[PDB]
């Protein structure tokens, strides 16, 4: 009963959740109305997998999810869409205004009056669960709701449950492309919550996925749907070990134990190797060695940072489909001899391997090809510091003149908090600069 609770906050969270639940329903053969005729035809099995779906008396399967937002529009789209019957009607939506890209508005003033009810529903879900593994929180840096309400929610969750694992999937601001003027303020404010309370957070950049779509899938005018589908594939690869049998199964505790050297350095990158279109799926062997090599390419990373400028501190490979341990062994041996990939001298092993028999599924109307073999990598490295550094500069350029600060302080936020928040990132940045130094 390897259960885990999904929470979605903000527009980005809700849309990524839509993609994720489409993928999950496709994976387990659950109809959009919650029925599973495959089990009726077969007559038995554990296809009502408890990792995501709770099975009621009549055979309907309710997902273990809590969508949260302040804009009625995004949730109302789900409540009258294809999957209107799938979710429990309690969708946790505020019939009021929204944070409007304001951390203080979403954390102090309007974040209240919804936190109690959301926590009540989360506790109600947790009561039904046995042997809960952890929480998967989807949100986005920059947005008012996804920053402030996520901060409040994670603080309360750390107070209440504490020991249970918590994983963040988030959309970090990009180096140049942005859809708001006050993104740096929100990110710099929410660093404290994503640093102190979360156990492991993955950063995702929009331009990285756009470049992947342009180069690999040959999509020329992608929208958010394709990015959400790729992120859903990432999350499914992460969570596959809990659902299906495999030669080497890696649950969440092993993953955290291997990828996190120190408490404050839990910011790994993520990537997916066999991202390829159906047209280009041919003319390609797509062996284990090829996908393992492709995982290391700087171009295929999901965050705009060059791993060559940093040091690899830990890795975790999760394979799916027709994979044999000998080929993974050979690929890792080939990788270790490459000189472009530098490993910190205090981690001689620096690899975790997981293999699963269930191959990835193909969503109808998607862009990814059907492949009998795939691998998803998580890599804890020191290059991520660069991704923070640029943002810090931007924040300074806006804080020297106190631009837009009156909006934040008008919602009960104290000015000095801004400075404090910046200091945290500085300290965090310094930690990376200390951990990559070779021993003497």
């Amino acid at each position: 009963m390897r259960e885990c609770i999904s929470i979605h906050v903000g527009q980005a969270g809700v849309q990524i959740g839509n993609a994720c639940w489409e993928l999950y329903c496709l994976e387990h053969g659950i109809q959009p109305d919650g029925q599973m005729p495959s089990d009726k035809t077969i007559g038995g099995g554990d296809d009502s997998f408890n990792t995501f779906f709770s099975e009621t008396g009549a055979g309907k399967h309710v997902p273990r999810a809590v969508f949260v937002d302040l804009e009625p529009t995004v949730i109302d789209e789900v409540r009258t869409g294809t999957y209107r019957q799938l979710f429990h009607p309690e969708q946790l939506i505020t019939g009021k205004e929204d944070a409007a890209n304001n951390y203080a508005r979403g954390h102090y003033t309007i974040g209240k009056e919804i936190i109690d009810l959301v926590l009540d529903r989360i506790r109600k879900l947790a009561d039904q669960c046995t042997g809960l593994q952890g929480f998967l929180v989807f949100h986005s840096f920059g947005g008012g709701t996804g920053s402030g309400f996520t901060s409040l929610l994670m603080e309360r969750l750390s107070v209440d449950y504490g020991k249970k694992s918590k994983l963040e999937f988030s959309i970090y601001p990009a180096p140049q492309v942005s859809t708001a003027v006050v993104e740096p303020y929100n990110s710099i404010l929410t660093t404290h919550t994503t640093l102190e309370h979360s156990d492991c957070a993955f950063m995702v950049d929009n331009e990285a996925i756009y470049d992947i779509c342009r180069r690999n899938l040959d999509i020329e005018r992608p929208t958010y749907t394709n990015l959400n589908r790729l992120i859903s594939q990432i999350v499914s690869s992460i969570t596959a070990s809990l659902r299906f049998d495999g030669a080497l199964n890696v649950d969440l505790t092993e993953f955290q134990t291997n990828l996190v050297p120190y408490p404050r350095i839990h910011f790994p990158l993520a990537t997916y190797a066999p991202v390829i279109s159906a047209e280009k799926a041919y003319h390609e062997q797509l062996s284990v060695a090829e996908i393992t090599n492709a995982c290391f390419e700087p171009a295929n990373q999901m965050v705009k940072c060059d791993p060559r400028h940093g040091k690899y501190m830990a890795c975790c490979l999760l394979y799916r489909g027709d994979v044999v341990p000998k080929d993974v062994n050979a690929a890792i041996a080939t990788i270790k001899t490459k000189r472009s990939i530098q490993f910190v001298d205090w981690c001689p092993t620096g690899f975790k391997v997981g293999i699963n028999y269930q191959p990835p599924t193909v969503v109808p109307g998607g862009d990814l090809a059907k492949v009998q073999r795939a691998v998803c990598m998580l890599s804890n490295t020191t290059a991520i510091a660069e991704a923070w550094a640029r943002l810090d500069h931007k924040f300074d350029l806006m804080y020297a003149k106190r631009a837009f600060v009156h909006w934040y302080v008008g919602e009960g936020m104290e000015e000095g908090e801004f400075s404090e928040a910046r200091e945290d990132m500085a300290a965090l940045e310094k930690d990376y600069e200390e951990v990559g130094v070779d021993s003497v």
Binding site: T257, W346, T349, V353
Partner: protein, 430 residues
């Protein structure tokens, strides 16, 4: 009548145990349902060693399956020989150790050890005259290392006189499936050296080398490695189940192979291995078995014997053969390779002969070596341990469960002392 109680912990231990129970079951003609459909009388002469009689004239293996994750139990039950094991011996919990030795030893396993010992105490009480135990577990993981070491300690407190075997898989030099292998390996080796009578060292690198170079398999899987290991385990205890010219229980090996109490780490091997198509060329004879036994690449431990000296070795032959040929072959192996055997142990080759070979073969042989080269393995692990302990790479995961740096220091010191003790005799001219 001499009974062996079998224990298996962790994923690797459970897999090897399942394959081993398939192999032994064939030798003694046991159906998957438990009924006996053999031909020879000798198959039932000593069935009691590994099996208990049931009231319905069916045989239940005397095994304890242990884990902290129901997945491996479910995999074992839903298998070709899943129904053979009795359901009461499936002892497990939830929230597995997850490659954390402290969780396996202190936090999680301590809650489950009581239940496990209870089954063991029951199984043991039924036996007429218990010889010893044997445990299968990989040292690289959390559940295996932790719960195996804890069970070994508890059993040695409870049963000091009996024998304690161990078929453990060490971390490999190059291949590494986990990031925190050295910590678990060091702590497990610290626990094993004090509370065991024998310990057979197995390495996945060596087994893959055997599969590629010798057997010429193209795409080996864990099934083949478990096949090799299970062949070795069945070879070791052959003399307690069939007659022969010279018998040799587990103790007779322990006495003949262990000169000093702390040197009980053995390198196993098996012969023949004809690679599925070359058997028609080579003629199976005793000298061929000796040659393939004493070959360097045939060892399962990934340590070259030629880099050290043989403290003492044992050869268990199975089949109809002459004693003169065996004795002269062992003498010739001693005399030819005079520099690879110590000088203060004359005639350091134990020999046992059984006259009931495996079903598909005319002859076979099992090799157990005790050399000084094994220290290399530990030395390697020690280096990696230091490389992660100077900076405390992943220490916060362990210290959160109650351990402290002092225990790591004790483990490192004990491992280094063992390495020095092994290096004491690897020299020339004194």
């Amino acid at each position: 009548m001499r009974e062996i109680v079998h224990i298996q912990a962790g994923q690797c231990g459970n897999q090897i145990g399942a394959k081993f129970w398939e192999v032994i079951s064939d030798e003694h003609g046991i159906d998957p349902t438990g009924s006996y459909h053999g031909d020879s009388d000798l198959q039932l002469e000593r069935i009691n060693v590994y099996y208990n009689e049931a009231t319905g004239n069916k045989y239940v293996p005397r095994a304890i399956l242990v884990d902290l994750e129901p997945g491996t139990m479910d995999s074992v039950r839903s298998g070709p020989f899943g129904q053979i094991f009795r359901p009461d011996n499936f002892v497990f919990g939830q929230s597995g150790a997850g490659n954390n030795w402290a969780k396996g030893h202190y936090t999680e396993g301590a809650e489950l050890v009581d239940s496990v010992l209870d089954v063991v105490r029951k199984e043991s009480e039924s036996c007429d005259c218990l010889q010893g135990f044997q445990l299968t577990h990989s040292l690289g993981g959390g559940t295996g290392s932790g719960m195996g070491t804890l069970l070994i300690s508890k059993i040695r407190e409870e049963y000091p006189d009996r024998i304690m075997n161990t078929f453990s898989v060490m971390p490999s030099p190059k291949v590494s499936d986990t990031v925190v292998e050295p910590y678990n390996a060091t702590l497990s080796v610290h626990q094993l050296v004090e509370n065991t009578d024998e310990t057979y060292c197995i390495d996945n690198e060596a087994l893959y080398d055997i599969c590629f170079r010798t057997l010429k398999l193209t795409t080996p899987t864990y099934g083949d490695l478990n096949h090799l290991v299970s062949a070795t385990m069945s070879g070791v205890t052959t003399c307690l189940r069939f007659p022969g010219q010279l018998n040799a229980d587990l103790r007779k090996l322990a006495v003949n192979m262990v000169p000093f109490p702390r040197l009980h780490f053995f390198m196993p091997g098996f012969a023949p291995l004809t690679s599925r198509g070359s058997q028609q060329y080579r003629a199976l004879t005793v000298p061929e078995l000796t040659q393939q036994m004493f070959d360097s690449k045939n060892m399962m431990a990934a340590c070259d014997p030629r880099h050290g000296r043989y403290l003492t070795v044992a050869a268990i032959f199975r089949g109809r053969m002459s004693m003169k040929e065996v004795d002269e072959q062992m003498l010739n192996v001693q005399n030819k390779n005079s520099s690879y055997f110590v000088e203060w142990i004359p005639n350091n080759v134990k020999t046992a002969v059984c006259d009931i070979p495996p079903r598909g073969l005319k002859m076979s042989a099992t090799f157990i070596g005790n050399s000084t080269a094994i220290q290399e393995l530990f030395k390697r692990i020690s280096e990696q341990f230091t490389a992660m302990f100077r900076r405390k790479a992943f220490l916060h995961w362990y210290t959160g469960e109650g351990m402290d740096e002092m225990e790591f220091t004790e483990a490192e010191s004990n491992m280094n002392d063992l390495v020095s003790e092994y290096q004491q005799y690897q020299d020339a001219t004194a």
